[PDB]
């Protein structure tokens, strides 16, 4: 029912955690994601009722993969002290680990880290309350057009099969970072209107109507999961957004259009064409412009808000 955001912290000038809680409450933002442990933040969110995804940082995967004691320590230090007052719902063990050159060094730690974090939750008696997954980039997807033909790249199938079985066994969601922006930027034969949810001819695929690129990308992931024998794993969109400066189509107007339209889309009952009828759990990337991101200028312009909490552009955060 309420939208989520990524609470990215890679800026040198961002608000206190308490101010961030107030900003989310004021704007009916009901879910948030952090990329790593942060006690000050989890403390600030106590009794806020905001649902929280806490990450294991990619650089922390090796420790928790290599030892159950380490994974137990991670849960006991970073999660257990804050639950249930802070409503932690998921641990996202790693971010964009697979099919990403910068993270190739961490790939061998991914699956054992997921499993050890799960065991650590069980050891803490938190397994009924908090589930475990990992956030994937779209680089894990091989074929994506048409969405019905979606597959995983051959190179990730082994890892992905293991991950999907884990998810099925634990009733845990696939977490996807999904950016029509990047798909469009890299292939200008895509219609910009389709990327933005603007009026555009729908794409009919096996009787299903794709009115926008977001739905097409998400459904390619669903088809890919089905192709590995997993038709019943839900998807949480851990990131989606559109930068407001730094490229021809990275503008105030386009970011405003994309994020307003995305919110209206995912909070509605539309669903996606393969899974219609229910809201899509989504975390906008990101709450603030983050002035230490880079190197490309677009990276510093993913915020719904400037660091002073002034909107970068107006956003309707609810269906009301």
How was this entry determined? X-ray
For 46, other C-beta atoms within 10 Å of its C-beta total 13
Write out the residue range of the structural domain in which residue 113 sits: 1-320
Q: Are 87 and 49 in contact (CB under 8 A)?
A: yes
Q: 186: which residues sit within 8 A by CB, 6+ positions away?
A: none
Q: How far is CA 291 from CA 133, 164, 298, 302, 303, in A?
A: 28, 35, 10, 10, 10
Q: Are 91 and 79 in contact (CB under 8 A)?
A: yes
What's the CA dihedral at 102, 121, 167, 108 to 10 degrees? 30
Positions of E strands within the chain: 3-6, 29-34, 51-56, 87-95, 131-136, 174-177, 203-205, 208-210, 235-240, 282-284
> What CA–CA distance (Å, rounded) separates 172 from 115?
13
> What CA–CA distance (Å, rounded) separates 46 from 44?
6
> What CA–CA distance (Å, rounded) separates 186 from 92?
27
**CA 52 from centre of chain:** 12
Q: How far is CA 259 from CA 81, 199, 253, 265, 314, in A?
A: 34, 16, 10, 10, 10
**Straight-line distance from the first to the last Cα atom of the chain, in angstroms, rounded to the nearest whole number:** 11
Pairing of strands 208-210, 203-205: antiparallel
Q: Are 38 and 317 in contact (CB under 8 A)?
A: no
Phi, psi of 126 (to 5 degrees): -105, 5
Residues composing the chain: 320
> Could you tell me which of 224, 226, 190, 220 has the C-alpha nearest to residue 208?
220
Bridge partners of residue 250, in order along the sequence: 247
SS3 at position 304: coil
Q: Which tokens belong to 148?
A: 């019905």
Counts of helices then strands in the chain (DSSP H, E) = 10, 10
* Tokens 């001819």 belong to residue: 201
Assign residue 246 the CATH number of its domain.
3.20.20.80
> What CA–CA distance (Å, rounded) separates 189 from 282?
27
Q: Which residues are part of the catalytic machinery?
A: 96, 239
Q: Which tokens belong to 124?
A: 């803490």
Do you find a cis peptide bond into 286, omega within 30 degrees of 0?
A: yes
Q: Are 189 and 157 in contact (CB under 8 A)?
A: no
Phi-psi region of 130 (alpha: psi -120 to 50; beta: other; left: phi over 0): beta
> What CA–CA distance (Å, rounded) separates 5 from 251?
20
Q: 307: which residues sit within 8 A by CB, 6+ positions away?
A: 11, 13, 14, 15, 288, 289, 291
> What CA–CA distance (Å, rounded) separates 280 from 263?
10
**CA 135 from centre of chain:** 6
Q: How many domains does the chain have?
A: 1
Q: How far is CA 13 from CA 29, 289, 307, in A?
A: 21, 10, 6
Q: Are 103 and 62 in contact (CB under 8 A)?
A: no
> Could you tell me which of 65, 56, 63, 58 has the C-alpha nearest to residue 33?
56
């Amino acid at each position: 029912e309420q939208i989520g955001v990524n609470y990215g912290m890679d800026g040198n000038n961002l608000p206190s955690a308490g101010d961030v809680v107030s900003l989310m409450k004021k704007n009916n933002i009901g879910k948030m994601r952090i990329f790593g442990p942060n006690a000050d933040v989890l403390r600030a969110f106590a009794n806020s009722r905001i649902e929280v995804i806490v990450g294991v940082e990619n650089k922390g995967l090796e420790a928790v993969a290599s030892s159950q004691d380490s994974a137990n320590g991670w849960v006991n230090d970073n999660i257990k002290p804050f639950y249930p007052s802070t409503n932690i719902k998921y641990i996202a063990v790693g971010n964009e680990v697979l099919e990403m050159p910068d993270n190739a060094q961490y790939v061998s730690f991914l699956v054992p880290a997921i499993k050890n974090i799960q065991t650590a939750l069980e050891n803490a008696n938190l397994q009924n309350n908090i589930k475990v997954s990992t956030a994937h980039a779209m680089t894990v997807i091989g074929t994506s057009s048409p969405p019905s033909k979606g597959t995983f790249k051959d190179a990730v199938k082994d890892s992905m099969s293991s991950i999907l079985q884990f998810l099925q066994d634990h009733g845990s969601p696939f977490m996807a970072n999904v950016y029509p922006y990047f798909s469009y930027d890299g292939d200008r034969s895509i219609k910009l209107d389709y990327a933005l949810f603007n009026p555009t001819p729908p794409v009919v695929d096996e009787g299903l109507s794709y009115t926008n690129l977001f739905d097409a990308m998400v459904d390619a992931v669903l088809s890919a999961m089905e192709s590995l024998g997993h038709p019943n794993i839900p998807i949480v969109i851990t990131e989606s957004g559109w930068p407001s400066a730094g490229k021809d189509v990275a503008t105030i107007e386009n970011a405003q259009t994309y994020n307003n339209n995305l919110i209206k889309h995912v909070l509605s009952n539309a669903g996606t064409p393969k899974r219609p009828g229910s809201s899509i759990e989504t975390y906008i990337f990101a709450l603030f412009n983050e002035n230490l991101k880079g190197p490309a200028e677009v990276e510093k312009h993913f915020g719904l808000f400037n660091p002073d909490e002034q909107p970068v552009y107006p956003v309707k955060f609810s269906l009301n």
